[PDB]
Design an enzyme around this catalytic site. Sequence first.
Site, PDB file in Angstrom:
ATOM      1  N   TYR A   1      -9.779  -1.896   8.068  1.00 18.96           N
ATOM      2  CA  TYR A   1     -10.048  -2.260   6.744  1.00 18.96           C
ATOM      3  C   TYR A   1     -10.005  -3.708   6.625  1.00 18.96           C
ATOM      4  O   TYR A   1      -9.704  -4.523   7.577  1.00 18.96           O
ATOM      5  CB  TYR A   1      -8.942  -1.726   5.677  1.00 18.96           C
ATOM      6  CG  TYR A   1      -7.510  -2.519   5.908  1.00 18.96           C
ATOM      7  CD1 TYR A   1      -7.142  -3.682   5.319  1.00 18.96           C
ATOM      8  CD2 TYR A   1      -6.493  -1.683   6.659  1.00 18.96           C
ATOM      9  CE1 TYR A   1      -5.806  -4.132   5.398  1.00 18.96           C
ATOM     10  CE2 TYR A   1      -5.292  -2.349   6.634  1.00 18.96           C
ATOM     11  CZ  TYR A   1      -5.007  -3.559   6.278  1.00 18.96           C
ATOM     12  OH  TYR A   1      -3.658  -4.115   6.180  1.00 18.96           O
TER      13      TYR A   1
ATOM     14  N   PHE B   1      -7.429 -11.247   2.022  1.00 19.66           N
ATOM     15  CA  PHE B   1      -6.005 -11.340   1.914  1.00 19.66           C
ATOM     16  C   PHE B   1      -5.456 -10.456   3.232  1.00 19.66           C
ATOM     17  O   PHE B   1      -4.323 -10.842   3.582  1.00 19.66           O
ATOM     18  CB  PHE B   1      -5.336 -10.721   0.651  1.00 19.66           C
ATOM     19  CG  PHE B   1      -5.414  -9.337   0.354  1.00 19.66           C
ATOM     20  CD1 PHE B   1      -4.932  -8.267   0.875  1.00 19.66           C
ATOM     21  CD2 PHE B   1      -6.465  -9.057  -0.769  1.00 19.66           C
ATOM     22  CE1 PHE B   1      -5.091  -6.989   0.743  1.00 19.66           C
ATOM     23  CE2 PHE B   1      -6.548  -7.769  -1.055  1.00 19.66           C
ATOM     24  CZ  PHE B   1      -5.997  -6.799  -0.499  1.00 19.66           C
ATOM     25  N   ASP B   2      -6.243  -9.841   3.709  1.00 25.25           N
ATOM     26  CA  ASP B   2      -5.663  -9.223   5.047  1.00 25.25           C
ATOM     27  C   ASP B   2      -6.909  -8.069   5.520  1.00 25.25           C
ATOM     28  O   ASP B   2      -7.821  -7.743   5.199  1.00 25.25           O
ATOM     29  CB  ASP B   2      -4.431  -8.068   4.749  1.00 25.25           C
ATOM     30  CG  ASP B   2      -3.937  -7.510   6.191  1.00 25.25           C
ATOM     31  OD1 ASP B   2      -3.634  -6.599   6.284  1.00 25.25           O
ATOM     32  OD2 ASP B   2      -3.187  -8.610   6.739  1.00 25.25           O
TER      33      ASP B   2
ATOM     34  N   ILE C   1      -1.014   2.543  -1.952  1.00 26.76           N
ATOM     35  CA  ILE C   1      -1.315   2.059  -3.251  1.00 26.76           C
ATOM     36  C   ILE C   1      -2.421   3.461  -3.618  1.00 26.76           C
ATOM     37  O   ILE C   1      -3.044   3.810  -2.748  1.00 26.76           O
ATOM     38  CB  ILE C   1      -1.895   0.752  -3.563  1.00 26.76           C
ATOM     39  CG1 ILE C   1      -3.113   0.659  -2.780  1.00 26.76           C
ATOM     40  CG2 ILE C   1      -1.057  -0.190  -3.504  1.00 26.76           C
ATOM     41  CD1 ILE C   1      -4.008  -0.551  -2.933  1.00 26.76           C
TER      42      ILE C   1
ATOM     43  N   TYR D   1      -1.164  -3.017  -7.433  1.00 25.70           N
ATOM     44  CA  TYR D   1       0.028  -3.613  -7.537  1.00 25.70           C
ATOM     45  C   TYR D   1       0.496  -4.116  -9.140  1.00 25.70           C
ATOM     46  O   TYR D   1       1.396  -4.566  -8.995  1.00 25.70           O
ATOM     47  CB  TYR D   1      -0.105  -5.088  -6.611  1.00 25.70           C
ATOM     48  CG  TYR D   1       0.041  -4.633  -4.991  1.00 25.70           C
ATOM     49  CD1 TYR D   1       1.191  -4.243  -4.406  1.00 25.70           C
ATOM     50  CD2 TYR D   1      -1.397  -4.497  -4.446  1.00 25.70           C
ATOM     51  CE1 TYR D   1       1.011  -3.662  -2.956  1.00 25.70           C
ATOM     52  CE2 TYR D   1      -1.233  -4.195  -3.379  1.00 25.70           C
ATOM     53  CZ  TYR D   1      -0.189  -3.727  -2.691  1.00 25.70           C
ATOM     54  OH  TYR D   1      -0.428  -3.467  -1.211  1.00 25.70           O
TER      55      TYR D   1
ATOM     56  N   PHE E   1     -11.611  -3.262  -1.017  1.00 22.43           N
ATOM     57  CA  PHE E   1     -11.338  -2.920   0.258  1.00 22.43           C
ATOM     58  C   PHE E   1     -12.658  -2.659   1.028  1.00 22.43           C
ATOM     59  O   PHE E   1     -13.064  -1.502   0.486  1.00 22.43           O
ATOM     60  CB  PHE E   1     -10.238  -2.063   0.525  1.00 22.43           C
ATOM     61  CG  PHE E   1      -8.851  -2.503   0.414  1.00 22.43           C
ATOM     62  CD1 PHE E   1      -8.283  -2.399  -0.980  1.00 22.43           C
ATOM     63  CD2 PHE E   1      -7.819  -2.809   1.354  1.00 22.43           C
ATOM     64  CE1 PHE E   1      -7.040  -2.740  -1.305  1.00 22.43           C
ATOM     65  CE2 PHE E   1      -6.564  -3.480   1.113  1.00 22.43           C
ATOM     66  CZ  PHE E   1      -6.407  -3.326  -0.201  1.00 22.43           C
TER      67      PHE E   1
HETATM   68  C1  LIG Z   1      13.731  -0.260  10.423  1.00 25.76           C
HETATM   69  C2  LIG Z   1      13.193  -1.382  11.415  1.00 25.76           C
HETATM   70  N1  LIG Z   1      11.639  -1.136  11.404  1.00 25.76           N
HETATM   71  C3  LIG Z   1      10.966  -1.522  10.128  1.00 25.76           C
HETATM   72  O1  LIG Z   1      11.488  -2.133   9.271  1.00 25.76           O
HETATM   73  N2  LIG Z   1       9.416  -1.283  10.090  1.00 25.76           N
HETATM   74  C4  LIG Z   1       8.480  -2.025   9.134  1.00 25.76           C
HETATM   75  C5  LIG Z   1       8.041  -0.375   8.661  1.00 25.76           C
HETATM   76  N3  LIG Z   1       7.404   0.373   9.623  1.00 25.76           N
HETATM   77  C6  LIG Z   1       6.149   1.188   9.506  1.00 25.76           C
HETATM   78  N4  LIG Z   1       5.526   1.395   8.281  1.00 25.76           N
HETATM   79  C7  LIG Z   1       4.035   2.329   8.076  1.00 25.76           C
HETATM   80  N5  LIG Z   1       2.963   2.242   6.898  1.00 25.76           N
HETATM   81  C8  LIG Z   1       3.209   1.307   5.519  1.00 25.76           C
HETATM   82  C9  LIG Z   1       4.178   1.891   4.751  1.00 25.76           C
HETATM   83  C10 LIG Z   1       3.922   1.112   3.273  1.00 25.76           C
HETATM   84  N6  LIG Z   1       3.107  -0.310   3.584  1.00 25.76           N
HETATM   85  C11 LIG Z   1       2.075  -1.218   2.743  1.00 25.76           C
HETATM   86  O2  LIG Z   1       1.920  -2.349   3.117  1.00 25.76           O
HETATM   87  C12 LIG Z   1       1.236  -0.556   1.460  1.00 25.76           C
HETATM   88  C13 LIG Z   1       2.013  -1.406   0.188  1.00 25.76           C
HETATM   89  C14 LIG Z   1       3.445  -1.091  -0.219  1.00 25.76           C
HETATM   90  C15 LIG Z   1       3.190   0.367  -1.280  1.00 25.76           C
HETATM   91  C16 LIG Z   1       3.678   1.707  -0.557  1.00 25.76           C
HETATM   92  C17 LIG Z   1       3.534   3.218  -1.485  1.00 25.76           C
HETATM   93  C18 LIG Z   1       2.679   2.841  -3.126  1.00 25.76           C
HETATM   94  O3  LIG Z   1       2.615   4.111  -3.976  1.00 25.76           O
HETATM   95  C19 LIG Z   1       3.106   5.296  -3.428  1.00 25.76           C
HETATM   96  C20 LIG Z   1       2.283   1.443  -3.755  1.00 25.76           C
HETATM   97  C21 LIG Z   1       2.463   0.363  -2.610  1.00 25.76           C
HETATM   98  N7  LIG Z   1      -0.190  -1.155   1.518  1.00 25.76           N
HETATM   99  C22 LIG Z   1      -1.293  -0.595   0.785  1.00 25.76           C
HETATM  100  O4  LIG Z   1      -1.067   0.407  -0.110  1.00 25.76           O
HETATM  101  C23 LIG Z   1      -2.371  -1.236   0.994  1.00 25.76           C
HETATM  102  C24 LIG Z   1      -3.484  -0.232   1.700  1.00 25.76           C
HETATM  103  C25 LIG Z   1      -3.319   0.038   3.196  1.00 25.76           C
HETATM  104  C26 LIG Z   1      -3.492  -1.146   4.096  1.00 25.76           C
HETATM  105  C27 LIG Z   1      -2.571  -2.485   3.350  1.00 25.76           C
HETATM  106  N8  LIG Z   1      -2.512  -2.490   1.736  1.00 25.76           N
HETATM  107  C28 LIG Z   1      -2.373  -3.884   1.221  1.00 25.76           C
HETATM  108  O5  LIG Z   1      -2.637  -3.967  -0.023  1.00 25.76           O
HETATM  109  C29 LIG Z   1      -2.704  -5.251   2.080  1.00 25.76           C
HETATM  110  O6  LIG Z   1      -3.391  -5.458   2.888  1.00 25.76           O
HETATM  111  C30 LIG Z   1      -0.990  -6.129   2.196  1.00 25.76           C
HETATM  112  C31 LIG Z   1       0.141  -5.220   1.990  1.00 25.76           C
HETATM  113  C32 LIG Z   1      -1.164  -6.663   3.585  1.00 25.76           C
HETATM  114  C33 LIG Z   1      -1.394  -7.226   1.212  1.00 25.76           C
HETATM  115  C34 LIG Z   1       0.283  -7.214   0.155  1.00 25.76           C
HETATM  116  C35 LIG Z   1       3.757  -1.058   4.737  1.00 25.76           C
HETATM  117  C36 LIG Z   1       3.473  -0.333   5.957  1.00 25.76           C
HETATM  118  N9  LIG Z   1       3.781   3.299   9.178  1.00 25.76           N
HETATM  119  C37 LIG Z   1       4.934   3.348  10.451  1.00 25.76           C
HETATM  120  N10 LIG Z   1       4.293   4.099  11.535  1.00 25.76           N
HETATM  121  C38 LIG Z   1       5.436   4.895  12.352  1.00 25.76           C
HETATM  122  C39 LIG Z   1       5.513   4.237  13.611  1.00 25.76           C
HETATM  123  C40 LIG Z   1       4.524   4.324  14.801  1.00 25.76           C
HETATM  124  N11 LIG Z   1       4.749   3.561  15.679  1.00 25.76           N
HETATM  125  N12 LIG Z   1       5.872   2.988  15.820  1.00 25.76           N
HETATM  126  C41 LIG Z   1       6.742   1.935  16.406  1.00 25.76           C
HETATM  127  C42 LIG Z   1       6.365   3.342  14.370  1.00 25.76           C
HETATM  128  C43 LIG Z   1       2.787   4.669  11.678  1.00 25.76           C
HETATM  129  C44 LIG Z   1       2.582   6.079  12.095  1.00 25.76           C
HETATM  130  C45 LIG Z   1       2.078   5.485  10.749  1.00 25.76           C
HETATM  131  N13 LIG Z   1       5.833   2.397  10.609  1.00 25.76           N
HETATM  132  C46 LIG Z   1       8.490   0.826  10.833  1.00 25.76           C
HETATM  133  C47 LIG Z   1       8.759  -0.707  11.552  1.00 25.76           C
END
Ligand SMILES: CCNC(=O)N1CCN(c2nc(NC3CCN(C(=O)[C@@H](CCc4ccc(OC)cc4)NC(=O)[C@@H]4CCCCN4C(=O)C(=O)C(C)(C)CC)CC3)nc(N(Cc3cnn(C)c3)C3CC3)n2)CC1
EC number: 5.2.1.8
Lengths: 109, 108, 108, 109, 101, 102, 103, 101
Positions: D28, D38-39, D58, D84, D101
Site C-alpha cells: 500500500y 504519509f506511509d 480502519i 481516524y 490508499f
Molecule cells: C508487545 C511487544 N510487541 C509490540 O508492541 N508490537 C507492535 C504490534 N504488533 C503487530 N501489529 C499488527 N497489525 C496492526 C494492528 C493495528 N495497526 C494500524 O496501524 C491501523 C491504525 C490503528 C487502528 C486499528 C483498528 C481500527 O478499527 C477496528 C481503527 C484504527 N492502521 C490502518 O487501519 C491503516 C490501513 C492499513 C495500513 C496502515 N494504516 C494507516 O492509516 C497508516 O499508514 C499509519 C498507521 C502508518 C498512519 C497513522 C498497527 C499494526 N500485526 C502483527 N502480526 C503478528 C506477528 C507476525 N510476526 N511477528 C513477529 C508478529 C502480523 C500477522 C499479522 N503484530 C506486534 C509487535
Amino acid sequence: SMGVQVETISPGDGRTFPKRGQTCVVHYTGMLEDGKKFDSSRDRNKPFKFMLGKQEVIRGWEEGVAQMSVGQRAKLTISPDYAYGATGHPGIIPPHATLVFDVELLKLE
Amino acid sequence: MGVQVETISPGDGRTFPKRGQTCVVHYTGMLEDGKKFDSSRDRNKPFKFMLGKQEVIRGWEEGVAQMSVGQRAKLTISPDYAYGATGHPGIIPPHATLVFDVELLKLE
Amino acid sequence: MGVQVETISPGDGRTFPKRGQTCVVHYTGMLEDGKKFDSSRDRNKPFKFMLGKQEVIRGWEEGVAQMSVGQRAKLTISPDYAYGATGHPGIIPPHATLVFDVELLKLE
Amino acid sequence: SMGVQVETISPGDGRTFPKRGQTCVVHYTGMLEDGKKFDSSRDRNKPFKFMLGKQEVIRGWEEGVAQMSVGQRAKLTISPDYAYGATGHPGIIPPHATLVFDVELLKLE
Amino acid sequence: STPIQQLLEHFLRQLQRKDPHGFFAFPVTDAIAPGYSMIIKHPMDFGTMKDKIVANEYKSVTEFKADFKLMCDNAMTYNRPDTVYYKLAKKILHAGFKMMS
Amino acid sequence: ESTPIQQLLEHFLRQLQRKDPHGFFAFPVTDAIAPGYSMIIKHPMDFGTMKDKIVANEYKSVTEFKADFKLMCDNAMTYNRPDTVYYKLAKKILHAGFKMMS
Amino acid sequence: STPIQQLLEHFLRQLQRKDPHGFFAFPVTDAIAPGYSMIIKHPMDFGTMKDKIVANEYKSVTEFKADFKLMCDNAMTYNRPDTVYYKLAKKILHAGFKMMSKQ
Amino acid sequence: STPIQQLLEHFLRQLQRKDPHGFFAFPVTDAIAPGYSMIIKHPMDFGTMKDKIVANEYKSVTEFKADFKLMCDNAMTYNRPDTVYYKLAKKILHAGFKMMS
Ligand SMILES: CCNC(=O)N1CCN(c2nc(NC3CCN(C(=O)[C@@H](CCc4ccc(OC)cc4)NC(=O)[C@@H]4CCCCN4C(=O)C(=O)C(C)(C)CC)CC3)nc(N(Cc3cnn(C)c3)C3CC3)n2)CC1
Ligand SMILES: CCNC(=O)N1CCN(c2nc(NC3CCN(C(=O)[C@@H](CCc4ccc(OC)cc4)NC(=O)[C@@H]4CCCCN4C(=O)C(=O)C(C)(C)CC)CC3)nc(N(Cc3cnn(C)c3)C3CC3)n2)CC1
Ligand SMILES: CCNC(=O)N1CCN(c2nc(NC3CCN(C(=O)[C@@H](CCc4ccc(OC)cc4)NC(=O)[C@@H]4CCCCN4C(=O)C(=O)C(C)(C)CC)CC3)nc(N(Cc3cnn(C)c3)C3CC3)n2)CC1
Ligand SMILES: CCNC(=O)N1CCN(c2nc(NC3CCN(C(=O)[C@@H](CCc4ccc(OC)cc4)NC(=O)[C@@H]4CCCCN4C(=O)C(=O)C(C)(C)CC)CC3)nc(N(Cc3cnn(C)c3)C3CC3)n2)CC1
C-alpha cells in the site's frame, strides 16, 4: 453448538448475496430433526419476506441465509442455541430442538 | 461497561425478572484467564436469589435483569461491578474481572 | 437493550470518561420516528455533565461512558434507561425509545 | 457519508475474495487528499499483513479490501468517519482527513 | 560476570518466562506495525536488554528496570487497549515491578 | 464380553455420530466420488471403521480413539476446500467431539 | 344508523386515526406472519370491526371494546416486545380505553 | 451575480468537492461510453451545471436540484451496479441532497 450448517441442494448464481438492510424473499419448509414438518411457506403458496439486520428471525436464519446467493436452494441445519433454545415455541417447536429448513432464496428487494 | 451480556442460547424474549422475584439459575464462575472458582452445577443444585434484595454483586443484579427465562448467557463483569479492590479473600484476587456462564432457568 | 451505541465516526479509542470528569458533548435528540425534541447544536453551545453525578438519564450515563474522546455515535435508549412510563410531560411521551446523535468533544 | 470508494487500477482475478479470518497480504501507499504521502509498505520493501474480522484496521480498509480480489490493485478513497475521525493520528494524519490508499492485494494467507 | 550481571540475568529469564510467545523478544518492525517508528521514539526489547547485560552496560538494577518499563510503556502506547499486546504489556509490567521491588 | 474400553468408546462414538446426522463421515471416501482422494489422503478414517475397530477390540486406549477421530476430521479439512459443507462440518465436529469427550 | 352505531363509528374513526400506517386495517395473514394462525386463535382487525358495526352486530359499546382489546391483545401476544407492532398495540390499547372509559 | 446564482454556485462547489476524481466533471462521450446517447436521453454533468449558472438559466434551486438528480440518475442507469461509477452516483446523490437540505 454446531450452530447452523448450510448444504446446497441446487446452486444460486454464486455472486448476489444479501447485505444488511435488504429484504430477502424466500420459500421454506421447516422440519424437526426427525423429519416431522412444522411449517412451510410453500404450503401457503406465498413466499416469506424478511430483512437482514432487523432482528426478525432466529440466529440460524440470520447467519445461514446471509451465506446464500439468489437462486440458491439449501438445507439449513440449526442447533437449539441458534433456534428457540430451552423454550422452544410452545405447541410448535419442543424444547432444545435442532431444526432443519429447506430454504430457497428467490429474490432480493 | 460494568457487565457485558453475550447470549449463548436464547430465552423466550418476553419474561424478564422484576423486583422481588426469585431467579433460579445454574452458573459457572471463572476468572478472566479461565480458571474456575465455583459452579452450582457441581453441586447439582441451582442457585436462587431475589432481585432487588441486595443479595448479589452488581454485575449479576444488572446482568441477570437483562435476561429472559430460558436464556443462557456469558456475563463479563468489571471489578467495580464485582469484588473491586478487596476481592474475596482466598477466592477472588483484587481487581479481578469475572466471567460467569449463567442460565436463567425459572422465576419464582 | 437499554442503550445501543453505534459509531458514526471513531474516537481516539483510548481516552474514555471516568468518574468525576466532565464530558463536553454536542447532541441531537429525536424520538424513534425521527422527530427532533432538542439539540445543543441549535444553541451553539455544547452540553456538559459530570460522569458519576446522576445528572443524566441512565442511557446517557452508560452510553457516553462507552465512548472515547472524538467519537460521534448514535445512542438508542429504551424507556427503562430514559424517561420510562411517565415520560417528560409535553416533551417526551410515555414509554418512549429515544435516539441521540452524540459527539464526545472533550473531557474537562 | 461518502464512506469508502474502491476504484480499480489494475484487475485481480475477480473470483478470489478474502473471507473473515483470512490474512490479507497487501502492498500500500497512503496519502492525504492533497497527495502528500504519509506511509508506504513499498517504501519498506515488505508487504503488510492483517486479518479480516479482527478490528486490526480502519473501517475503510475493512470494507474496502473485502471488495478486492487477489491480484487487484485499487485506489481506496476513505472519508474521515471510515478513518481516524476527529482525532486523526497525531503527528501523522490531521483531524477530519479523507485518506487515499493505493492498495494491491497480493495474496491470501 | 559481576553480582549485578547475574541478578539481572536471573530477572530477565524470569520475565521472559512470562512472555512464552516472544511478543517482546525482538525489536518491533514497521513492516509488522506500520508507523511504529513514528510513534515510539526509543524502542526496547528483551533481546536488546540481554545484549546490554552481556556488555555490562547497566550501571544499576534501576537502569535495568527503566528499560523494562520503557519496553512495556512503548507497547501500551503503540497498541490499542483491546489487543493482546496491550493486555500483556500491562500484565508483565506489574509482575516485573513486583518481582524487582 | 465387552471390555470397559470397548463400552466407553462405543458410547463416545454414538454421541459423535449423532453430530453427523446426514452420515457424511459414515463410510470411507471412494476415489469414484472424490478423484485423487487416496493420493491426497494417505490414512483415511471414518465412523464405520472406528466402529469396526471397537468391535474387534483394536483400540488400546481412549487416546488412540481420539486420534482416529481427529484424523478423520483433519482428512476432511485437507481434502475439501474451506467453502464446502464438508470442510465446515469437519471443523465444527472436531471441536464439538473433543468438548464432549472430557 | 342507531345511536350505538353512530358512536361506535365515531370511536372507530378516532381509533383508526391512531394507526396511520394501517397495521390493524386487515386480518394478519400467515404469509406475512408465520404461525400467526397457530398462536392467535381469535383474530381481530379494524376492518372486521367496521363490518360488524355496519351489520349492527354489536349490542353494546362494551362488546365493541372487547373486540378492540382482543385486537390489541393478539398483537402483544404474537409480536415480540421490541417490535413496532407490539409498541403500537400497547399505545393504541391505552389510548382507546382512555377514550371509551366512560363507556 | 444574482442571489440565486450565488447560492447555486456555493452548492455546486460543495457538490464537486465530493467528486475529487472528476467522474462527473464533463459530458460523457459516445467514444468513451458506446451507446451512451442511445441510453441516456438528457445528459448532465457538473460542467454543464456551472455553465447553466453563469448564463443565468436556473430559475430556482428546485431546477438545480433536478439537474443534480438527473446526473446521478443517468449514471445509475448507464453503469452497472458493480462499478465505481454506479456506487459514486448513489453515494453523491444522497450526500448532496443532505448537504443542500
Ligand atoms: C508487545 C511487544 N510487541 C509490540 O508492541 N508490537 C507492535 C504490534 N504488533 C503487530 N501489529 C499488527 N497489525 C496492526 C494492528 C493495528 N495497526 C494500524 O496501524 C491501523 C491504525 C490503528 C487502528 C486499528 C483498528 C481500527 O478499527 C477496528 C481503527 C484504527 N492502521 C490502518 O487501519 C491503516 C490501513 C492499513 C495500513 C496502515 N494504516 C494507516 O492509516 C497508516 O499508514 C499509519 C498507521 C502508518 C498512519 C497513522 C498497527 C499494526 N500485526 C502483527 N502480526 C503478528 C506477528 C507476525 N510476526 N511477528 C513477529 C508478529 C502480523 C500477522 C499479522 N503484530 C506486534 C509487535
Ligand atoms: C399490529 C397488528 N399487526 C400484527 O400484529 N401483524 C403480525 C406481524 N406482522 C409482520 N411480521 C414480519 N416478519 C416476522 C417477525 C418475526 N417472526 C418469526 O416468526 C420468527 C420467530 C420469532 C423470532 C424473531 C427474532 C429473533 O432474533 C434472534 C428470534 C425468534 N421466525 C423464524 O425465525 C423462523 C425462520 C423464518 C420463517 C419462520 N420461522 C420458524 O421457526 C417457523 O416456521 C414458526 C415461527 C411457524 C415455528 C415457531 C414473525 C414475522 N414482516 C412484516 N412485513 C410488513 C407488512 C405487514 N403487513 N403487510 C401486508 C406487510 C414484511 C415487509 C417484511 N409484517 C404485521 C401483522
Ligand atoms: C467430510 C467426510 N467426507 C469427505 O471428505 N468426502 C466424501 C464427500 N465429498 C464429495 N466430493 C464430490 N466431488 C468433487 C469435490 C471437488 N473435487 C475435485 O476433484 C477437483 C480438484 C479440487 C478443486 C474443486 C473446485 C475448483 O474451482 C471451484 C478447483 C479445484 N477436480 C477437477 O476439477 C478435475 C475435473 C474432473 C474430476 C477430477 N479432476 C482432476 O484434475 C483429477 O483428475 C485429479 C483431482 C485426480 C488431479 C488433481 C473432488 C470431486 N461429490 C460428492 N457426492 C455426494 C456423495 C455421493 N456418494 N457419497 C458417499 C457422497 C456426489 C453428488 C456429487 N461428495 C468430499 C470427500
Ligand atoms: C459517473 C458519471 N460518468 C459516467 O457515467 N460515464 C463516464 C465514465 N464511464 C466509462 N466507461 C468505459 N468503458 C465501458 C463501460 C461498459 N460499456 C459497454 O458498452 C458494454 C455493454 C455494457 C456491458 C459491460 C460488461 C458486461 O460483462 C461484464 C456485459 C455488458 N459494450 C460491449 O460489451 C460491446 C463491445 C464493444 C463496445 C460496445 N459494445 C456493444 O454491444 C455496442 O456497440 C452498444 C453498447 C452501442 C449496443 C449494445 C460502456 C463503456 N471507459 C472509461 N474511461 C475513463 C475516461 C473518462 N474520460 N476519458 C477520456 C476516459 C477510459 C477506459 C476508457 N469511462 C461510464 C460513463
